[PDB]
Structure formats: structure tokens, C-alpha cells
Design a protein around this ligand. Structure first.
Ligand SMILES: C=CCO[C@]1(C(=O)O)C[C@@H](O[C@]2(C(=O)O)C[C@@H](O)[C@@H](O)[C@@H]([C@H](O)CO)O2)[C@@H](O)[C@@H]([C@H](O)CO)O1
Ligand code: MG
Ligand code: MG
Ligand code: ZN
Lengths: 222, 218
């Protein structure tokens, strides 16, 4: 099974540097070109660079937008792909994806980016890291009931929310974060049969990797 | 410098209908020797990574349903989806790989469904927030269609305008509805000066506002 997992995303001050990684498994790494693609919040995908396979001498190419500024490399012994990013700007803020590129020497060569990691997020900003406050949303006072969590005042993005450790997935809405005064706020709602709450527990799980915050907040009536 | 552009930027279609979207390249993506066009289409569903649909202009990736058809040659290319499903909601990107790789700007495909009234829930501030001097009141408006809606907050009958932050989800991949969240943030001092807190939703499915409230002195 082909697997690609990006890491190293985070908050970085303008002009600073940051190096992402992409761990791979489930295929002969050195046989394949590898690419990095990125996506600013709400914008289009942008191809940034690739590095060729062993037969091709592991040579590199870059898009105009990052050439001279980013460096793509690979470690063929631990099967890692890297991207060193320098002199960072606000416009470099995005989710960065590593993607398996072509093996032109393969009898099954087809030209495309066929496997993509889940992406690692990067924010380029002078603002300070701030953990979220997580507050329960219970009705003050039929059939279904809607509960929620309010995740307030954090920086930077992202945060993740699940309910009962993912075992509640249907009936969930997690709203896109909104930025205000250098601080994000987002909410999540979950809707369950009133027969199952509060007789059964409902808990939201909130993580904020930039501050290593992990929270479980039980929604109790009141 | 191959420039990719796509059309339309966005559109909406009812389930079971046919969708045609277009991709143009500033130069030919065709290798005359091999007869291959270096053009691929990717699907990106909300909150997911991009997924490969088609490569070489017309070859379907394994696992991809045949309602997805890729055609075209040289500089002009077309992705067609017949009998669109609700799950097909996504941004669709074409990408040249003839000279390095360049992505188009994408086409946002949305789905038309019957109108649906929002389900509105209001939530008072938690005692844990209050204990720190702040007071947020939240309003969820869930599973409506169409997207267009307006929420008014009223404090003791009068509209409050500032302190309000709003957010809309992407379309639901299942029921093709939208949802919205509206949060009113006050200091504990402000919140304690008033009693009635009201969230009012304006949507074409109802001639009068859809209201939820609570009283602080409840
Ligand atoms: C069928 C491929 C023929 O040219 C190759 C080869 O060894 O098969 C592969 C070429 O691949 C690239 C490249 O830049 O490495 C990437 C491909 O996705 C595509 O962009 C092609 C491009 O269409 C070639 O004109 O280039 C390349 O390595 C190539 C050498 O540059 C020339 O032989 O070799
Ligand atoms: Mg829903
Ligand atoms: Mg007032
Ligand atoms: Zn070169």
C-alpha cells in the first residue's frame, strides 16, 4: 500500500526558514520522481518542484515562483522527500502536499501525480502562537438534539475536531475558522437523537498542534 | 511558461444531469512522437487531498467510475460527467505535465437540490467562558438550501451588529445542503446588562424570520 505523510508544517516568521518532510512507503522510492504542490487557503493548487528518480540522476526542477528560494531533496536510504523553504513570505502560507510523480522507465509508466499525502499546513506570520479555549455548547432550554463546541482565540491554523473520538461522524458540521484580531475562532455542531443524550456521553476532541493542545470537553445538560 | 486556464470557474447541477467543463493550454501538450497529450484531471473534494481522475487526456485512473470522461487534444480539453452524483461535489483541476507541471485554476462543481429550511439552534455562553470575563452566544443554522441566507441578532429586541462573526460550510457531499454558524461575542459586563438574546434567520423558504432565543434571567 502506497503511503505518503507530510510533516514539519507550522508557524514561521516572515523572512524565516522551514523544512518540510514527506515519509514514504509501499513502493520502490528511488524508482519514482517526487513532487511538492501547495494550496493557499481557498485558492488553486500550485506545482512547486520535482526531483527525478535514480535512472535520471535525481536532478531537480522548480517553478518560477520558488526557484532560488526553495530546495527540493530526497534521502534514498530512509525513503524521505524534503523541501527546504527560505526567505518566507505571507504568500507562502498554504497546505503543502508531497505527491508521487512518474517512473518513465516503468513498463507501466503513465504521466500523472497518482498518490498524494494528507498535506502539512504552513503559516507565515509575525503573530504569536496562542492555544484555543474550548467551550461546550449545550441548549439553555424533540426527536433530535444539537450540541456543539466553540473553539475560540487560537493562532495559527489549523485545529482538528472530532466527536467521541470519531465514533460520532454522521450529523457533524465543523465550520471553517474565522480570523479576527490575529486570532481564529471556529465552531463544530453534532446532532444526535435526544434519547441518547444526556443518557450517553457526548464529548468533543479538539487538538491544536502548534501549541500541542489536546482537549476533551464533555457536553453536559445546563 | 505554459499557462493553464479553466472554464467555468463554478456552476451547479442537479443530480443525474450532465456536466461539461473545459481546460485550455497556452501551447500544445501533444507529443507528436508518442501521440500522447500530457494533460490530467484531478478531483478535490472539500477537506480532502486532490485525487487523480484522468491522465493522458482520456485515460481513466483505475477505480474511477466511467461517468467521468476525458477528451480533447492539443490545447483544448474537456472533462465530462454524466449522471452527476451528490458525492461529485468538488473542485476539478486540469494539469499539464508536458513541460514540468502547471495546474489550472479549477472549476467548482456544486449540486442543485430542492429548497430546504434551516434548522436553528441557539446556545448561551458557558459558565467556563463567563468565569473568564467573556460571553459568546452561538447560533447554528443547519442543512438549508439554497446557500443564500441572512442572520440578524437582537438584544432585548434591538439589532446588534458588531461582535458578530459568521462561517459557512462547504456543501454537504451527502444531502447537498449548506450550514452556517453565527457567533456573537460580548464581555460578561455587556451580556449581563441585557436579558433577551435572539438569533433570526432570513431564508427564501419562509416569509417570516426563523427565530431562536433564550433569556439570561431564565
Ligand atoms: C517518454 C518520456 C521521454 O523522455 C524521458 C524518458 O526518459 O522517457 C522522460 C522525460 O520526462 C520529463 C522530465 O522533464 O524528466 C517529465 C515528463 O512528465 C515530461 O514533462 C517530459 C517532457 O514531455 C519531455 O519533453 O519530461 C525527460 O526526462 C526526458 C529527457 O529530458 C529527454 O530524453 O526523458
Ligand atoms: Mg448535515
Ligand atoms: Mg447595547
Ligand atoms: Zn533540467
Amino acid at each position: 500500500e502506497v503511503k505518503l505523510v507530510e510533516s514539519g508544517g507550522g508557524l514561521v516568521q516572515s523572512g524565516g526558514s522551514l523544512r518540510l518532510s514527506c515519509a514514504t512507503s509501499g513502493f520502490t522510492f528511488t524508482d519514482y520522481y517526487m513532487s511538492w504542490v501547495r494550496q493557499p487557503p481557498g485558492k488553486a493548487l500550485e506545482w512547486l518542484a520535482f526531483i527525478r528518480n535514480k535512472a535520471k540522476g535525481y536532478t531537480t526542477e522548480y517553478s518560477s515562483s520558488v526557484k532560488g528560494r526553495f530546495t527540493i531533496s530526497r534521502d534514498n536510504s530512509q525513503s524521505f522527500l524534503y523541501l527546504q523553504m527560505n526567505t518566507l513570505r505571507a504568500e507562502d502560507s498554504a497546505t503543502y502536499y508531497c505527491a508521487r510523480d512518474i517512473n518513465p522507465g516503468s513498463d507501466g509508466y503513465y504521466d500523472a501525480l497518482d498518490y498524494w499525502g494528507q498535506g502539512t499546513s504552513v503559516t507565515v506570520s509575525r503573530a504569536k502562537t496562542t492555544p484555543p479555549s474550548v467551550y461546550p455548547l449545550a441548549p439553555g432550554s424533540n426527536s433530535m438534539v444539537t450540541l456543539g463546541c466553540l473553539v475560540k482565540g487560537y493562532f495559527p491554523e489549523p485545529v482538528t475536531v472530532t466527536w467521541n473520538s470519531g465514533s460520532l461522524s454522521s450529523g457533524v458540521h465543523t465550520f471553517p475558522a474565522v480570523l479576527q484580531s490575529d486570532l481564529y475562532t471556529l465552531s463544530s455542531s453534532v446532532t444526535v437523537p435526544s434519547s441518547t443524550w444526556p443518557s450517553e456521553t457526548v464529548t468533543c476532541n479538539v487538538a491544536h498542534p502548534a501549541s500541542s493542545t489536546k482537549v476533551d470537553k464533555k457536553i453536559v445538560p445546563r | 511558461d505554459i499557462v493553464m486556464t479553466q472554464s467555468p470557474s463554478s456552476l451547479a447541477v442537479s443530480a443525474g444531469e450532465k456536466v461539461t467543463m473545459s481546460c485550455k493550454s497556452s501551447q500544445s501538450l501533444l507529443n507528436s512522437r508518442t501521440r500522447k497529450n500530457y494533460l490530467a484531471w484531478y478531483q478535490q473534494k472539500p477537506g480532502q487531498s486532490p485525487k487523480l481522475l484522468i491522465y493522458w487526456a482520456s485515460t481513466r485512473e483505475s477505480g474511477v467510475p466511467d461517468r467521468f470522461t476525458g477528451s480533447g487534444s492539443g490545447t483544448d480539453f474537456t472533462l465530462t460527467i454524466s449522471s452527476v452524483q451528490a458525492e461529485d461535489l468538488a473542485v476539478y483541476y486540469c494539469k499539464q505535465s508536458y513541460n514540468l507541471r502547471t495546474f489550472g485554476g479549477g472549476t467548482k462543481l456544486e449540486l442543485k437540490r430542492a429548497d430546504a429550511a434551516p434548522t436553528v439552534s441557539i446556545f448561551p455562553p458557558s459558565s467556563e467562558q463567563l468565569t473568564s470575563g467573556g460571553a459568546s452566544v452561538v447560533c447554528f443554522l443547519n442543512n438549508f438550501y439554497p446557500k443564500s441566507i441572512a442572520v440578524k441578532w437582537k438584544i432585548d429586541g434591538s439589532e446588534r451588529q458588531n461582535g458578530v462573526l459568521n462561517s459557512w460550510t462547504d456543501q454537504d457531499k451527502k444531502d447537498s445542503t449548506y450550514s452556517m454558524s453565527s457567533t456573537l461575542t460580548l464581555t460578561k459586563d455587556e451580556y449581563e446588562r441585557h436579558n433577551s438574546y435572539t438569533c433570526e434567520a432570513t431564508h427564501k423558504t419562509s416569509t417570516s424570520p426563523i427565530v431562536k432565543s433564550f433569556n439570561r434571567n431564565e
